[PDB]
Amino acid sequence: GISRDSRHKRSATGAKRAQFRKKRKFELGRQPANTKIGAKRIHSVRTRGGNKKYRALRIETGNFSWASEGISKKTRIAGVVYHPSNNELVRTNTLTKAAIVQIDATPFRQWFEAHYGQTRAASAKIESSVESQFSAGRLYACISSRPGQSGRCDGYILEGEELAFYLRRL
Amino acid sequence: VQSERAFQKQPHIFNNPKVKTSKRTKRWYKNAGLGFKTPKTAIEGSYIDKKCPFTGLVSIRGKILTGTVVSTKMHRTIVIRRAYLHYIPKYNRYEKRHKNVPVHVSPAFRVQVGDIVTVGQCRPISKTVRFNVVKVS
Amino acid sequence: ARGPKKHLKRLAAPHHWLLDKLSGCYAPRPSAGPHKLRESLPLIVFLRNRLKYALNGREVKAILMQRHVKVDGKVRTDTTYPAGFMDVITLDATNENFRLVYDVKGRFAVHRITDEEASYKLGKVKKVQLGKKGVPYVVTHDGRTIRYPDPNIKVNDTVKIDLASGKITDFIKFDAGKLVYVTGGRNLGRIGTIVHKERHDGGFDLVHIKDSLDNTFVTRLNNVFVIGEQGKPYISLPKGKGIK
Amino acid sequence: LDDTLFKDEITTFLTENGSQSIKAEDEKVVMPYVLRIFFGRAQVPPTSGQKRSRKIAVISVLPNFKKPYINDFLSLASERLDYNYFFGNSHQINSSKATLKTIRRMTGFVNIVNSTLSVLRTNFPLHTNSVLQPLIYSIAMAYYVLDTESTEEVHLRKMASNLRQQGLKCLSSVFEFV
Amino acid sequence: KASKGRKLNYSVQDPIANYEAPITSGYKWS
Amino acid sequence: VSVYQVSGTNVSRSLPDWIAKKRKRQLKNDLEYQNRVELIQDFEFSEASNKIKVSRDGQYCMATGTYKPQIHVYDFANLSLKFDRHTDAENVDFTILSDDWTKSVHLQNDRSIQFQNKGGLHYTTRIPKFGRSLVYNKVNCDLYVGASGNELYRLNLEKGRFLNPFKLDTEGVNHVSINEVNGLLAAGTETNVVEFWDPRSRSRVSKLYLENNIDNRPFQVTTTSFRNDGLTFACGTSNGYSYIYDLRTSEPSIIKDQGYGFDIKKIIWLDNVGTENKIVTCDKRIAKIWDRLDGKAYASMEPSVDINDIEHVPGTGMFFTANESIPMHTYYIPSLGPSPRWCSFLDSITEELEEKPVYSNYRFITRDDVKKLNLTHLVGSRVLRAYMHGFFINTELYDKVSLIA
Amino acid sequence: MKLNISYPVNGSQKTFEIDDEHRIRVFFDKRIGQEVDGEAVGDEFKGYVFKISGGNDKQGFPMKQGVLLPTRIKLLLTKGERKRKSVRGAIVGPDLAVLALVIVKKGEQELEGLTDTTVPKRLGPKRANNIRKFFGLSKEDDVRDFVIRREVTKGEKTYTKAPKIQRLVTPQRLQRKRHQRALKVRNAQAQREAAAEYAQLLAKRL
RNA sequence: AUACAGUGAAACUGCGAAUGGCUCAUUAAAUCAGUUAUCGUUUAUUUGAUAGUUACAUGGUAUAACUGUGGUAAUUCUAGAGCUAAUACAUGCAAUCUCGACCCUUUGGAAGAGAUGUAUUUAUUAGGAUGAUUCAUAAUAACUUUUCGAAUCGCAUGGCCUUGUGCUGGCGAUGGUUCAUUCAAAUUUCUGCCCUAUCAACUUUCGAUGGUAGGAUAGUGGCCUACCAUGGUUUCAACGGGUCGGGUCCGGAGAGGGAGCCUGAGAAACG
Ligand SMILES: [Mg+2]
Ligand SMILES: [Mg+2]
Ligand SMILES: [Mg+2]
């Protein structure tokens, strides 16, 4: 019963517009998908046209990208740590775009030690904060794919000004 | 500039923390066209504005209008007034009419109350904003 | 309506068909096809109300499925197939070849042509763009997407398509002094030479056209169709040579 | 074994430090089966994007293993190949072994190694018997077949050229990483 | 502020008026 | 003791349910598929279930869904779905005002209270700040809504009037519960304190500070519940510790450890069933039954999927649980009491039932916590019986090492 | 109650009226899918085993698996949309007019109407591999010889009717597959030629 | 017609049922008339381009019509048996092009070196067309409960030979990925004749105005949610009050009551 019609709103002048017509299909909105960490559960949606949409109702794994080395690995999500819109999404481990989450650091550590043979030196140098996060065992990453719509939760590991700003906000 | 809960950045522009060639963060900008010069403050500024017509994800297309600034209280958006003459046939005479058009203005423009601004149409940016300030005089 | 329309009331039909009022309550609705609805002449009207070969829809239907008609070198079997500007209709049995070109009055003209000119048509290259796998292509006004075009071809040019193979035999650039045919506006059906093209950035361009009589008019660029070099049209023109 | 759950099962069951990972006391008994189970998946033809994804996954899980286990997996690849006679003698090929079947098994072995190098890179465990001497013998086979075979055996020759191209590439890689 | 109900409004609300009637018995303990 | 799973997924925890639907077509030939008995038709949601409650009259049940957020109502007299009703946003908590299903109030997650009447959505009102729990006072017809902010909102159904909100010293109310005998309200704050309020007046009768000696970690009160006796009181913590309090004395009469370190999601008092001294403390993973006097474990329910809510049909031995699974589980412990009247013949098939049975008995510990407690030297000893990624220790021995550590 | 018994191996079926209440009692309290011993039913059924399969009550409402009641209920039965229709419970009880049974195992004595007689399968295989499975033909043998034929006599005229084999390998299908592959190759060659000509055109222009 | 073959009831599949018709209660920029954009979107169908990456052809994981046995007062009510098919439902398989020594022959052959789908999501790199792009397009790394890449049908029986029914095949139909085209749909820019001040404030009183992040959308967008700023219209008439549209055609709205769902390209469907 969610609608996107602009008729029920007030005009710019403040006039209360009257009901012109019953709700229609081409002005549809559907109930939001509260993605949470847990065994992958996806419900399909038949949208306008033959197109189809996947709702990520629950998910534990996602592809994350290390931009500095230009690499992508599939990792587990530990939990939501900070979410720019609301914090009660941070509390319930709700997953949505722009959320800052903690991801397991294992595959990236493995790729690093493999590619550079370190736990030559100049290239192997990485940001101090990222190295500390590796020592911790979890990395801070930002979700860059809309879980509600596409059905996947891919994102990128934070770095640079991103990382400084969000660590401050934490 | 990072005055908000979320970090403002030009989407899909990447500054490589590993390389660190130059201090100047990479900034993307486009020329709007219609022979309208993109200001140098936008080119060399540091603001982040998704709706800025020169550094944001907006396109100028359609009608181009002019008006005189009447209010600037709203954040990054202003209220322009357009005046014209309406012909009443019964008295065979003309009366002065006005209409208030709100518009978006990028921070790369500095606008005061009363100046004359040329705006261009763009996709609906808000409930009533459908234009973008593109030249100030 | 909550969906597409499938009927067409007679009075609402395009005027240039000249449908008899006392015939009935409806008119043939052109099916989706190469040419837009208002700019198209369905084969039923062309065979019945223009050539008079068939006396009713049934006989036109029989004619079509006997496979006596070829639109752009291809046999078609739809009664409401929307033939349009520069579409070659061939009836081998009667040995007739027709090219649909507006007259001065602005209505489709029954224009008989010989075979050798019937081998090809003209198309205005509305769009030029790279397709998948980096294969350049051009979209003409009749929908035919031609791949691997000549590089010099750009928007608004004309391309001479050989009907048999569907390839570009030659082309005409859009420039002053070129012979042009009007396909829209109040000057539809007039022929002239380009003089000046007013460029209004981001708006509808205008083209100034001078006829053989030295009368001048202005028409929007969308409605201009380059047909050849002055004095040398690449097709036979209807009677009158598009004057007045 | 299930195709639908394979990707999820790998990341949950075999990931190092994973919650459901095999316990250290149980590694010895279980891992032999895991290597055999993953070995079969490595013999799928990568004809489609999903099948390509599956083949990368089986090689992508290798670093989670311990080094002794990784060496065993490479041994399983080379068990089918017969090379001991070659280094036993003065590096000479048996004409009987020179067949299309051997080359086909050979290309299968070399293909596994090139994939495994790419994932493990400098961490790749190299052992003379398990990997290197099968690898050298395979390049040794390629020269023999190419010189000895006559031109009418075009397809068998092409399988030889393919083996050589992969084999020399494999050597170029294996030095580079380790 | 008051928009979206973020400020508490203590007006009567007709649809929920007399939604349920209080029990006259009260608490079982005296 | 014998615990039977009347309904619920019977696959491995690692195997998700949706593939079982895909396996379903392949396994149609199998005899067990014919023999399996489903108690209520469609007793299942599309992806997951949030809350489950039983109407007081005893013939109807209501449940909430994840997507599309919907509201089933089951008719026990017909063992069937009565009607499903969609909503705008996912449910966080609700109550059934009427004795039947007709009359209910649902606190969604978009900060809106929706009043569902029998016909359909009656009225939707919004509280000033996000809600976390919802209780109804039958005596005053005043509905009390916990909130993220300090103030605890009050809505009066009789007058149709928001009244003066109560003001709590601390911010964040996780659960609220009303004692039937006395009207005492208990508010579970985020900080380790439970604040009691008088409804007839508007005051703070007292605040109880929860003290756990075992773990110095901070903990949040997540649930509360008053026994029908009108004197005893239960608390849950975010550390998985369930307290039983006699209200008069400040000391906790018993402290029981669930041992998995997971927040307690609900407490149910099994007084009605007979042998009144039993209680259920439901976790994310386990619902344990134990006796209020001795603290000894009576029975445990160990579903294969996370528990979101648990409900006990009054006067019977049945239990429903809303899970993260497609089906909602139904359990039946015959020892507690007779099967419900509508499940009159459930006893007949007891042998055909699954009869599910250490994990409840002991305390679970992670690998990291073993290091914190310096118990690494015992790894491999008969004291540490390793399961999954952690080690089990006797609850008594855990208390010993923790204080020393 | 009437017992509608079916023997699937022969394909036979017959109904036995029962007036005594005691075999009816041994039927009572069972559920669909359970098994019962014939001897309790009657010495004629001695040694037989009956699997209950369904039935109808005195008001004509059928029985459904999975519902643990002896009384009717209005259930949301499917065949997307599902009607709510009445159904009898799955527990056998005195209120049943007719009970359906399937003979799992044969006893000592032969029933007159079920074991002794047969009803032939109405239709035979039509897909080629099904014919092969029915006759166990080897790959070299052709099913075309072993097709089931049924004789039809109308007056003095007589002819044999046989089904059309589906999924049979014939020269036509080989021709079609060859044509598809050749078409694909031809298309690829055409595209290659076009690309080469385009490259040559650009080379001339440069 | 010794697999069927002419014709064909019944049933399963596919396509369509959102067109057409009929009544005017409502509402004074609400629809509407002209005018503008979609660089901001979806689109059955038509038209035109477009996919070299067990097989002499898989399964019932299958049932209808049909054969037979019954219940009930009983319906387009029904259960138990027994069959059988696909364009239904599931599953699924020895080539080309560059650089080209030998400069051998100078069109040319050629050692060797290489290179090789599409779709979803994200990250990252390059960038002919428009005034203008993070456009078209290409590349790298991974991801997918993830696709698609003929197990189809009619008519005809040609050309080769290596006589095996060996190889090579003509005209069509039905399908299918992406783009364009067409039929449409949805929002949207500017302009637009009643009386009115004895209607001067209205909005912000469950978003009013704007920023930013998210959710939903086919998408833009307070359309909806969180946080933040306090704004927006009006004496040039806002706000309020009274009094089907345009030109038979074109538009607008509507068919037990209200609440909720369902398919489909298109419906809050006259189902
Ligand atoms: Mg349809
Ligand atoms: Mg097509
Ligand atoms: Mg937005």
Side-chain angles (χ1 to χ4, degrees), chain B residues 27-47:
Chain B
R27 185 172 186 92
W28 168 90
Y29 58 93
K30 70 179 165 78
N31 48 348
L34 291 64
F36 274 12
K37 187 153 199 272
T38 176
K40 291 199 84 169
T41 181
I43 297 169
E44 293 180 353
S46 67
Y47 64 81

Side-chain angles (χ1 to χ4, degrees), chain B residues 123-137:
Chain B
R123 63 182 175 86
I125 296 163
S126 297
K127 175 156 185 288
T128 55
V129 181
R130 279 100 172 86
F131 289 90
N132 211 344
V133 166
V134 69
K135 178 165 173 201
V136 184
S137 303

Side-chain angles (χ1 to χ4, degrees), chain B residues 27-95:
Chain B
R27 185 172 186 92
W28 168 90
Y29 58 93
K30 70 179 165 78
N31 48 348
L34 291 64
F36 274 12
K37 187 153 199 272
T38 176
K40 291 199 84 169
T41 181
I43 297 169
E44 293 180 353
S46 67
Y47 64 81
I48 301 299
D49 184 16
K50 67 186 286 188
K51 294 139 178 211
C52 167
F54 308 109
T55 71
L57 277 295
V58 190
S59 52
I60 313 293
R61 74 291 185 280
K63 312 261 199 155
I64 59 171
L65 294 174
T66 68
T68 188
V69 183
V70 162
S71 180
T72 62
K73 297 182 179 69
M74 321 175 307
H75 194 260
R76 295 182 179 195
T77 64
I78 65 182
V79 169
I80 312 171
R81 187 188 184 93
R82 66 181 62 255
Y84 63 110
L85 310 95
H86 193 26
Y87 193 10
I88 191 165
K90 176 179 179 189
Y91 292 165
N92 192 2
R93 270 164 185 90
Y94 300 85
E95 69 188 11

Side-chain angles (χ1 to χ4, degrees), chain G residues 161-174:
Chain G
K161 300 177 72 178
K164 185 176 181 177
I165 306 304
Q166 281 293 343
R167 193 175 295 170
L168 183 70
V169 173
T170 69
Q172 179 61 8
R173 290 182 64 193
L174 309 185

